[PDB]
Design a protein around this ligand. Structure first.
Ligand SMILES: CC(=O)N[C@H]1[C@H](O[C@H]2[C@@H](O)[C@@H](CO)O[C@@H](O[C@H]3[C@H](O)[C@@H](O)[C@H](O)O[C@@H]3CO)[C@@H]2O)O[C@H](CO)[C@@H](O)[C@@H]1O
Ligand SMILES: [Ca+2]
Length: 128
């Protein structure tokens, strides 16, 4: 049930997991929790999410708590600033070090506690 989009396959999970357990699942399937690197991809993901919440590859890295992509795509603070839900990231409770797609909109992302369970999206490149 992997969905194809611009050179990548995506797995929208049917079972919810914590952020890290999700990532481990993706890694077991030769993939990673999805990065988002274009408006086109953001649109594909939130539309396919159909109004439900899915973990994506967003997580904090380094001392400063800068956001990063688990698949090692460099995180672009400028190009991504538009992809957060208004008021996010807010580090609510000072325990929100992972990110998910939450709203069906270009402003889709929320930071939430990594230990919360949600559905999740894996991304795997097509390699011919
Ligand atoms: C953990 C998390 O996702 N926190 C984000 C926070 O989500 C909370 C928000 O959606 C409110 C809406 O009222 O609901 C919270 O869940 C509650 C259920 O709605 C309620 O039925 C149940 O009994 O209790 C739940 C816990 O109170 C939900 O966690 O939303 C903010 C933005 O507003 C984010 O910044 C947080 O990351
Ligand atoms: Ca938040």
């Amino acid at each position: 049930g992997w969905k194809y989009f611009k050179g990548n396959f995506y797995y929208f999970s049917l079972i919810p997991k914590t952020w890290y357990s999700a990532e481990q699942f993706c890694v077991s399937r030769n993939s990673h929790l999805t990065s988002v690197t274009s408006e086109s991809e953001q649109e594909f993901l939130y539309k396919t999410a159909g109004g439900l919440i899915y973990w994506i590859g967003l997580t904090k890295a380094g001392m400063e708590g800068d956001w990063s992509w688990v698949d090692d795509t460099p995180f672009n603070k400028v190009q991504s600033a538009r992809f957060w839900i208004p008021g996010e990231p807010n580090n609510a409770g000072n325990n929100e070090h992972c990110g998910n797609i939450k709203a069906p909109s270009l402003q889709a992302w929320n930071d939430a506690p990594c230990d919360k369970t949600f559905l999740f999206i894996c991304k795997r490149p097509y390699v011919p």
